[PDB]
Structure formats: C-alpha cells, structure tokens
Amino acid sequence: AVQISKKRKFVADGIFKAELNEFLTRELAEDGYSGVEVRVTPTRTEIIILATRTQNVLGEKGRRIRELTAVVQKRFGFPEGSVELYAEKVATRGLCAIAQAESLRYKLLGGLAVRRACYGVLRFIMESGAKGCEVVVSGKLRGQRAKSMKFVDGLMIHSGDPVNYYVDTA
Amino acid sequence: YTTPKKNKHKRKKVKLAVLKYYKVDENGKISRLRRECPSDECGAGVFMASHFDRHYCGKCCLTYCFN
C-alpha cells in the first residue's frame, strides 16, 4: 500500500540490521560469528554471514542456514522467496575483535587461568599482523572483591577520528 | 501477615455420578425428560436445562422464559 517517509525509511532498515545482528550474535556466538552484511534489492535480498567457522553454520546438507533463513523470513516480514543467507569466511581470524572476544569467552568457560587465556590471545593477534592490541578482563577474579587485569601490548591510539576505523572494539 | 477474612476455597464441582436422562417403559422406548436446545446446532442433541420451572441452553447461553 502507501509507503512511509524517507527519514523513517533509513531508521527502519538500520533497526532491521541491528535486530538480526543481535539474534545472529546469540545463535552463532559459539561458532565464530564476526558480524553480518546486508544488501536489499527489489527481489531476493542477500545477507552474508561473516562466520569464521563456516563448517559449523552448515548442517548435514546445510540445515542451520535453512532454518536460520526461516526465522529471518518468518519474523521480518518477508514472503516465501525474498531473503537468502550465505556463510563466508572473514580474512585474518585474529584481526577482527569480535571473533576472539568470543573465542576467549569459551576459553574462560573452559576453566583456564584468566592470565593464561588472555596471553594466548594477546600473542595471537600480535603474530597475526597487528599494529597493537589490548584486552581488558574485569570482574570477579580470585578474590571476593572484583578487580580488572588489562594486558596491553604494542601501541594504540585513543583520540581523534582515526580511532573509528583503525580500531575495532568488542 | 494475617488474612483474617478467609477467602474460603476454590470451585469444586458437584460430582453427580449418574446420567439416567432417558426413562424407559414397555421393554424399550425412546422418551426424553429434558428439553432440547432450540439453537441452530443441537436439535435433540446437547440438552436444554430443566430447573424448577425454566429452561436454559448451557452451551450457547440462550435461555427460555421463566415459566
């Protein structure tokens, strides 16, 4: 029917984008998620996942895409044949910050020393071709009071606009 | 912390364990004892009530005059 204003066009598909980011975070966190990227056409829309483990999003003949197409389709108002999903591997696993934030999540769920787990990931980004990185793990460590242990290495800027694209946080 | 006024119980039903709404003489004879509902659905089906005088269709809540 009648269409809506351009000002609320742009906040509606921005909030479309933010919603399925949050769900595909909650689903694919254990499977190396690392974000999404959307393209709308006046046909089939195509959403590519940026999973690091593209094996695990695939089921036995790709189940967990086809039911993950269905929940995207049966919530966000798409007809039968208008949204498709693809899994794609993001280059340099240890250089996007969302990926190994989730990796050391399941390493600390694995029951490591928090100093042992953070060193393995600090050593991993700096050997993956990085200019600097730092990890802050903060909360209830060994002790009744919470405290924060940060593990900075290399150099890192903090102010201006180039800490918008030269960095990524997680 | 008291509740003096005693909200008494829930609803437990009357639990009347007998149908017998078809009396029979002469060794086999169909005979109603309760009126049927006059609705569009249950002609001689789900009964209409028999009170001390009135009739009432329980399923679709229509009632006949108190007589």
Partner: protein
C-alpha cells in the same frame, strides 16, 4: 480470568501502552522517527542504526 475483563483497561493512548521494541521498558522511550527503543540502550545500537556522533 473470565475474558470479558482480564485486559480490559484500555491500553491505547498513554505511556502504559508504549514500550521498547528491543528491551521492553515503558519509561524514557523515544518514539521519534518510529524508533521506539529505550533511552538507556538506544545508545548501544546507535551506531548499528548508523547514527554517528559529530565524529
């Protein structure tokens, strides 16, 4: 129960019927441009919408 007056107070106009579309509070929410998110964590997704601050 007794469906006639379970949810019978009219949730219509008024802040007892607006709510957050993410986060399900009824307080502080921003109904501008059809956002309908909570005040406190509009700020989370503000970059995911695409709203940059000044830089």
């Amino acid at each position: 129960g007794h469906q006639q007056l379970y949810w019978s107070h009219p949730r219509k106009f008024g802040q007892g019927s607006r709510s957050c579309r993410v986060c399900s509070n009824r307080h502080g929410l921003i109904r501008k441009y059809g956002l309908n998110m909570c005040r406190q964590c509009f700020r989370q997704y503000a970059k995911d919408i695409g709203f940059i601050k000044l830089d």
